[PDB]
RNA sequence: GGGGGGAGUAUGGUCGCAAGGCUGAAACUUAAAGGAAUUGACGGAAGGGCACCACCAGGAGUGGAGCCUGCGGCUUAAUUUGACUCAACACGGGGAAACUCACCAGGUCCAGACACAAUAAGGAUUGACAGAUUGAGAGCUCUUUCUUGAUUUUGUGGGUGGUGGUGCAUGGCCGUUCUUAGUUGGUGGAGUGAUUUGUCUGCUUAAUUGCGAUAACGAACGAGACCUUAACCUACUAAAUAGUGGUGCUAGCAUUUGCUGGUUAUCCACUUCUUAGAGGGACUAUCGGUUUCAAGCCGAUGGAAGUUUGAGGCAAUAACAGGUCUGUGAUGCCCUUAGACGUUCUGGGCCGCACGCGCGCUACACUGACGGAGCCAGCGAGUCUAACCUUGGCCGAGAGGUCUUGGUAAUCUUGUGAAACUCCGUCGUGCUGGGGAUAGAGCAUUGUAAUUAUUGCUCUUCAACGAGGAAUUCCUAGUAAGCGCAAGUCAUCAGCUUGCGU
RNA sequence: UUUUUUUUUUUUGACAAAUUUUUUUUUUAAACUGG
């Protein structure tokens, strides 16, 4: 062993970086000054009404599981 | 080397011991290792009497140049071992005996 | 004569048909050449002993054949690597399918502590469904948009790890010199000194073991002594976790009162056999013969035991550039430290074959092979929050399966009913019913996984080999050799080793 | 009666260069009243 060649395509390649977005927590503000649910919460019991399901294409995915709750619409 | 060494030599014959020895194996001086004994006394290293009267020692001391090996036998003497043999194998004492009256008098003595 | 060479050379003279004498430089070159003695080592030197890692007399072989196992070479993506006479080559406890693992093709992760500085509660950062992608249900990375919250991230220094290097920088351990008897102070004597004597002419011993001799005396380590183990004890201490006899109950046969058995404690008694504590026992005892008459040696008797009773364990001074950094959270220095040489995961390799070598296994058959029948050990190992050794019943040709059981063990496996061996029969001098390599098909078992056959079994296939050249190994009595068994390694794999008995 | 008394030898050439070096330490046990 006297040094390494790296056929593989030359990939330093990181992770996204947790990708940094904007200010993102918004249900909706109409005038003086009520709020409503936009991006529903969970059917979990463990999720009280503090989680938001994302919807990416005909999905609606919870992240506070780790992997799966899928109630889809 | 040779002062720690002498001073431990001492303290072992201050206290009783028939003999001891000490080695320091190393690098002492130089690059290349060497091997000094320090020794006084003398010391039984042949067979059972060794499970017996030595006591024996290894030590790594962890030096700048590398390591140096720490070597310490002691063979305290039988005579005052409480427990098991109270001498070496081949020790052999004779009762001094006490010296009696020629003639010893042909006679009775009676109750 | 005035360091060794150059060199008794050059030149001139002289002695002259000769060899050659006599006289006789320099340039240049060189740090020693040399003398006498000391301690080792060596000798195709001598004298005295000793060893089956020497021979003699022999035995069993190995070298020849097939295989399987290490090494070299070749090959390879890689075939990881150390060790090369004894003192490398069934060695690294190295019987590697993954793991081991160090090598090859690839993928993750940080397990980068702490300190400083920056980003950063308008979020430092972490994780993820589905799809793409990937060997892969790795959110690897990407598309998407949720979650997380101050531990992380980035940078600068470091930290840590490394079966990465150096065993020629070391420690420890081990092997070897070295199956032998050797080694060294103190005081005295000799010598200017290095050193020497002590530590020896002779005889003796396994022995620097002794008798002795003695400018030495008195000592120390090694040898021995010691410890373990194997042999003996009708002696002591007692044992339903070892036996024996009687006694009850009971089986068979004979019958006449006997013989062979069974009975988990029926009871009683005992310790010859077995166990293990304390001991006894051998001291070369008694006698005879030999030598300087000592140390000893030889023969016979007795004895369980007469080689140091057998076998080990232990084991000096000085050393080796012996092996090991791949046993170690032993370790210096060097290297590397995030796309890693760290670690982990999937695959593969270490096993790849024109060939050479070392250790071995099976054989070449009639002192044999096969089939029935007899039937005899010793050393050991074995499972609680884990599946170890397994009896017995049942199933199956077998391998094996299944239902139970005993055992944490002098209790059960297990009397380990081992194998050679023994008896009766079949074969009949034919590479044959010797040999079982190579190969085909099936059935199982271990394992997440068996292909490059793990291994076991069943049927078929039926190779060389007809006693092995030069060479060369081991061995002196319960030894060699034959024969199996337990343990280590292990989940599975023993053609290996460590022991044990026959 | 000085008396003792082992007769022997075929063949064995070679092994590149450099190297292994050891010094004597304690100056440290130095502290006391004059009332």
């Not at chain 1, 249900?27 to 019991?45: F, I, M, Q, W």
């Not at chain 2, 020895?21 to 042949?46: C, P, Q, T, W």
Request: charged share 30%; glycine share 8%; aromatic share 6%.
């Amino acid at each position: 062993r006297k040094k390494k060649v790296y056929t593989t395509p030359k990939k330093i390649k990181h992770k996204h970086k947790a990708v940094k977005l904007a200010v993102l927590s918004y249900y909706k503000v109409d005038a003086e000054g009520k709020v409503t649910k936009l991006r529903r919460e969970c059917s979990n019991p463990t999720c009280g009404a503090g989680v938001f399901l994302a919807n990416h294409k005909d999905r609606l995915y919870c992240g506070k599981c780790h992997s799966v709750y899928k109630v889809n619409a | 080397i040779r002062r720690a060494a002498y001073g431990v030599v001492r303290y072992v014959m201050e206290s009783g011991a028939k003999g001891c020895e000490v080695v320091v194996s190393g690098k002492l001086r130089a690059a290349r290792a060497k091997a000094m004994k320090f020794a006084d006394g003398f010391l039984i290293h042949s067979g059972q009497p060794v499970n017996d009267f030595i006591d024996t020692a290894t030590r790594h001391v962890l030096m700048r140049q590398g390591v140096l090996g720490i070597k310490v036998k002691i063979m305290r003497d039988p005579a005052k071992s409480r427990t098991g043999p109270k001498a070496l194998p081949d020790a052999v004492t004779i009762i001094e005996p006490k010296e009696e009256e020629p003639i010893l008098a042909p006679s009775v003595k009676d109750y």
